Amino acid sequence: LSAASFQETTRVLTDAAINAKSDSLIGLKENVIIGKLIPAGTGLSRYR
DNA sequence: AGGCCGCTGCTGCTCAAGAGGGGTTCGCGGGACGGCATCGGCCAATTGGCCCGGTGTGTCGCACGATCTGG
Numbered sequence: 001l002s003a004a005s006f007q008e009t010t011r012v013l014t015d016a017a018i019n020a021k022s023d024s025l026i027g028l029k030e031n032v033i034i035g036k037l038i039p040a041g042t043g044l045s046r047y048r
Numbered sequence: 049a050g051g052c053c054g055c056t057g058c059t060g061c062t063c064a065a066g067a068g069g070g071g072t073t074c075g076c077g078g079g080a081c082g083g084c085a086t087c088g089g090c091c092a093a094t095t096g097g098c099c100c101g102g103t104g105t106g107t108c109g110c111a112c113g114a115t116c117t118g119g
Contacts, residue, residue, distance in 0.1 A: 008062070 002029045 001023050004012045025031060028038045037043035 011061090 001033060002027055005029060005033065 004016075006012075023030060025034065026039065028040065031038045031043075042048075
């Protein structure tokens with residue numbers, strides 16, 4: 001997801017489709033894209 | 049003379065023209081049917097008038113009369 005949103009979307013998507021890659025949503029960009037709490041600052045589970 | 053190991057040039061991807069025939073729609077009307085909507089009566093029913101008939105208790109309109117403050 002992050003690689004596709006950076007640049008060269010077509011190549012990244014056609015490479016990820018063949019390998020059947022699974023995204024675990026650990027970064028900041030993916031959490032921003034799907035619309036949930038980023039895993040930093042006040043979005044950590046230690047504080048909430 | 050074929051196979052193969054590199055070079056080297058080239059290219060590509062990405063960031064800034066009528067006519068006939070037939071089933072179907074809808075669109076007007078067109079009226080028929082059934083239905084619910086609108087108008088003289090109407091009497092004896094709860095509330096609320098509207099009073100008789102007793103006093104009393106308590107406000108108000110005024111008489112006798114004492115105390116007190118000012119004049």
